[PDB]
Design a protein around this nucleic acid. Sequence first.
RNA 1: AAGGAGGUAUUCAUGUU
RNA 2: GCGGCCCCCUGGACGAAGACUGACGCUCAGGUGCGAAAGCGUGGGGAGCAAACAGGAUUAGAUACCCUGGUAGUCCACGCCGUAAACGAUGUCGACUUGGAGGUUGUGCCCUUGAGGCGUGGCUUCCGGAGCUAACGCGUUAAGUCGACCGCCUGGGGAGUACGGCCGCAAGGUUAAAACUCAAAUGAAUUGACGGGGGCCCGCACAAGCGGUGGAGCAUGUGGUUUAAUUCGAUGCAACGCGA
Lengths: 70, 152, 67, 117
Amino acid sequence: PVIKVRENEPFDVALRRFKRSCEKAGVLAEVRRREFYEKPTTERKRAKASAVKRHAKKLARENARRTRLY
Amino acid sequence: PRRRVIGQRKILPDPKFGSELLAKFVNILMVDGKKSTAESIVYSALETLAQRSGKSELEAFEVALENVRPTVEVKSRRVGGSTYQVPVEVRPVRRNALAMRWIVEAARKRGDKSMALRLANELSDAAENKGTAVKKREDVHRMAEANKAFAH
Amino acid sequence: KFCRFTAEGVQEIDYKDIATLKNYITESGKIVPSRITGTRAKYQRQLARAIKRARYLSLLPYTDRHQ
Amino acid sequence: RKQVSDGVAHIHASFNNTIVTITDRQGNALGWATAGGSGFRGSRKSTPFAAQVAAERCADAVKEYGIKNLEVMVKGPGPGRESTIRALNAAGFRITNITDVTPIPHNGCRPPKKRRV
RNA sequence: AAGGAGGUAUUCAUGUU
RNA sequence: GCGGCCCCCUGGACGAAGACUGACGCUCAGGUGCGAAAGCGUGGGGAGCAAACAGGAUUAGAUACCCUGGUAGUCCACGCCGUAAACGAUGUCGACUUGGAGGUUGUGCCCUUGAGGCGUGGCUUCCGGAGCUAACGCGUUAAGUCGACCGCCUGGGGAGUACGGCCGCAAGGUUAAAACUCAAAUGAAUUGACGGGGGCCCGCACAAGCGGUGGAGCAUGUGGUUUAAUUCGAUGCAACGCGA
Ligand SMILES: [Mg+2]
Ligand SMILES: [Mg+2]
Ligand SMILES: [Mg+2]
Ligand SMILES: [Mg+2]
Ligand SMILES: [Mg+2]
Ligand SMILES: [Mg+2]
Ligand SMILES: [Mg+2]
Ligand SMILES: [Mg+2]
Ligand SMILES: [Mg+2]
Ligand SMILES: [Mg+2]
Ligand SMILES: [Mg+2]
Ligand SMILES: [Mg+2]
Ligand SMILES: [Mg+2]
Ligand SMILES: [Mg+2]
Ligand SMILES: [Mg+2]
Ligand SMILES: [Mg+2]
Ligand SMILES: [Mg+2]
Ligand SMILES: [Mg+2]
Ligand SMILES: [Mg+2]
């Protein structure tokens, strides 16, 4: 994320652009993931668990529109 | 409180000057429900203070309040690691309460003979930024600034 | 999202076309997910291969910072 | 002594400490300052306020080069990373570029084992 | 970090930027 | 088990239409081969990481967790080893039996009007019907309904141990008891109570204040000690200015 300062752009405005650019490239998430080694089994387990719960919540939501709560 | 929704008790103004701040000051100074005793002390102290300063009683009293009012204090936070002193800005109502409390405490822990004379000297020291009351204001401020790192 | 290779009949993506491939890399230079661009999985694999071949021949940069 | 008027500020923002170094365009260090050397230890050394103070002290230290235009290269997942930039802008430099230079391996060396705390 | 909104999320000309 | 890109050598799977062989099939004890990681032998190589180890902290102790280092090992070549929660805890082959939403890879057709519509194959994820399931569940990829052939099970501990055989450089692996002992071990699900699990809420619970207690003297109760007796009871909160 290489942000060049634009003309007339105040520092706060440029800084917001730079922070969002980094958050878009996902630098901090990448660094946190590479702090410590995790076994391939741990990685696969975590990936599979997120998929299962994400799918379950989507299905739960898509059935919550069916019924009325009051 | 928990189910908060507590409402504020209205306080009548003082008879002689009609100021809610002076009425609260009498209340803070009062001990054991002896309001007549406390009221006499406040009026005597204000009269002598105004003879010294030479301004209106309410004005001179307000010029002492201005130099004791804190602008930031430190609460304690049990979230991060339970060791956090977080500086927080004080609302104006609490500023007046804290200034009055510190003024009264300083006047009590003094060396003069009568309470009226102790109170007048404390108000003068507050009006020239030299008393133990203004000392505690400065002390709280420096503590908040040393914890400014944790302000976030 | 609509795949821009299925609608054009493209068989192979080609690593020598540095106009289409520039649309499919980000500013940092990494390949954009197919979930964002709406490309199909078959063309996504072809596209990733083409981008990697272009990087070797220095038609595309590996990252935004080595230059 | 010598006059440059265009420098580069490198912010090395670790989890534990923040080091700010102002160099010339060619990589020659003019001055530096650290949060841990600006009067902060441990739980205060790793705070964004400490990073702001480090940048202030480095700017005050580089004053005799007449720097006017600063580029900024930020590196690391520090608690600072911004306090430093806002403090350089406050100190008076004209920030002209803000780039993140955090080293990312393309799956290079194995990282240390996970802490069991 | 805290809250709000939209979605399971985008088509939304390119250009400009 | 396999993850940059390129080349060389090479295995399987699937689809379309057609031609050909003419039951050539399925299963398989014994046997043979492949088989994570650690380990072993011989020689390389060694950046990072890291058993052992050394030091620093933590702790009542800390031969641990945490920190700083750090050797074998992890990498290569060639041999051993043959084992794992080697798991879908589900042997291989075949046939039959309501559906839905997807992924992935082919192919046919229709107006491709423009990523469209309509079919037909392979593999695959999730719901689910009848039926099966102690139950959880399972469900056309069965754990329904059937057939072929092989592997295994016969209370828990002793024990996957001893002895013997075979295999291995070793570590060990494989095959595999009995005496004795217990009247249970067990699987699923229900109601609780728990959790240094999760959420929502409340109370002078905390926070914000005011005044105290703990220090002094005395009054009073208890414990202890003392006594001929110091009558008996209450003694976590919820006994102790209590029965009195
Ligand atoms: Mg570490
Ligand atoms: Mg056999
Ligand atoms: Mg090995
Ligand atoms: Mg070896
Ligand atoms: Mg060796
Ligand atoms: Mg270690
Ligand atoms: Mg086994
Ligand atoms: Mg496995
Ligand atoms: Mg598995
Ligand atoms: Mg088994
Ligand atoms: Mg089901
Ligand atoms: Mg054995
Ligand atoms: Mg044996
Ligand atoms: Mg309290
Ligand atoms: Mg006492
Ligand atoms: Mg008694
Ligand atoms: Mg008793
Ligand atoms: Mg009795
Ligand atoms: Mg009793």
